[PDB]
Structure formats: structure tokens, C-alpha cells
Ligand binder design. Structure first.
Ligand SMILES: [Mg+2]
Length: 164
């Protein structure tokens, strides 16, 4: 069954709300497993405490760089980076969870949550999940972003893990 993960989002250290995702392990097991493990923190490193360093209203919220917190870092549980598992799922609208990357086969730990349909990313970024609960919290997060993605407040993952 597809695992479910949650993020407890905070603004400047204050709780904002919880966001949960369903990970499509049935279609992209390797990619889903990477995100799941990073969320539980079972490997000794992960998303807990990291921030969303790039938030662009009307486009997406990007995070996952738990090593450099600026988009230059992050790593997977399979090594620094791993292959594009497949492009079965498309960016069909708000709530889509997809892997950020630096070109073909450079998936690490960085990911983004779409806040709109972004078809031009199809075939370029691997989609592996979708917001299940808390899409309103994701939209709320946009209020702290900007055209170039720079955030006006510190948006962090105060806590995360696996549900169900
Ligand atoms: Mg992949």
C-alpha cells in the first residue's frame, strides 16, 4: 500500500499546520521510499528541521535541502543522487509532489509541492506523490514566498514522519 507522510510546518518557529502526502510507491517505489525514509529520519538524516528555501506563489513550494539549506545540497538514501525512476505521473495540478533536480538523473532529497498545474515539467521532474490533507497549509505557505522564491519568514519542517 502507498505510505503516508506528514510535515508539521512552522513559520519563524511557530506552528502553522500539518501537511500529509500519499506516496505513490505502487508506481515509483524507489523514489517514494527515499522520501519516506527521509521523513522518518531512520537513516540518521532527513527532513526534520529543514526549511522551504524557495517559495514562489502560484507555482510551487520547494524544500528538502537538509545539508546546505539553500538548494545546493541534500542527498538521497541511495547515494548523493539517483536516477529518474520513470515519468509515469504528470504535474496535473496543485498538490503534486515532485523531485527537484539539476538535470537528468540528479534526484537527491530536494522536492517541491506544486500550487498549480505545471505541465512543462512533465518528463523532466519525477512525480511521486500528492498532498492528501493540508493543502490549505501549503497555500498559506505561499504568503511567505516571492516571485524569485526568496522567503520573508523562516518556513521549516518542525517535525515529520510516517502516518498510518
Ligand atoms: Mg526518480
Amino acid at each position: 500500500v502507498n505510505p503516508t507522510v506528514f510535515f508539521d510546518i512552522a513559520v519563524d518557529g511557530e506552528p502553522l499546520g500539518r501537511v500529509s502526502f500519499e506516496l505513490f510507491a505502487d508506481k515509483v517505489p524507489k523514489t517514494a521510499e527515499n522520501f519516506r525514509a527521509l521523513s522518518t529520519g531512520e537513516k540518521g538524516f532527513g527532513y526534520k528541521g529543514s526549511c522551504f528555501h524557495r517559495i514562489i506563489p502560484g507555482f510551487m513550494c520547494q524544500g528538502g535541502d537538509f545539508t546546505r539549506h539553500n538548494g545546493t545540497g541534500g542527498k538521497s538514501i541511495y547515494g548523493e543522487k539517483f536516477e529518474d525512476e520513470n515519468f509515469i505521473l504528470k504535474h496535473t495540478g496543485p498538490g503534486i509532489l515532485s523531485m527537484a533536480n539539476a538535470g537528468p538523473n540528479t534526484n537527491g532529497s530536494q522536492f517541491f509541492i506544486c500550487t498549480a498545474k505545471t505541465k512543462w515539467l512533465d518528463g523532466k521532474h519525477v512525480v511521486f506523490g500528492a498532498v492528501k490533507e493540508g493543502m490549505n497549509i501549503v497555500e498559506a505557505m505561499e504568503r511567505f514566498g516571492s516571485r524569485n522564491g526568496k522567503t520573508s519568514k523562516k518556513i521549516t519542517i518542525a517535525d515529520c514522519g510516517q502516518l498510518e
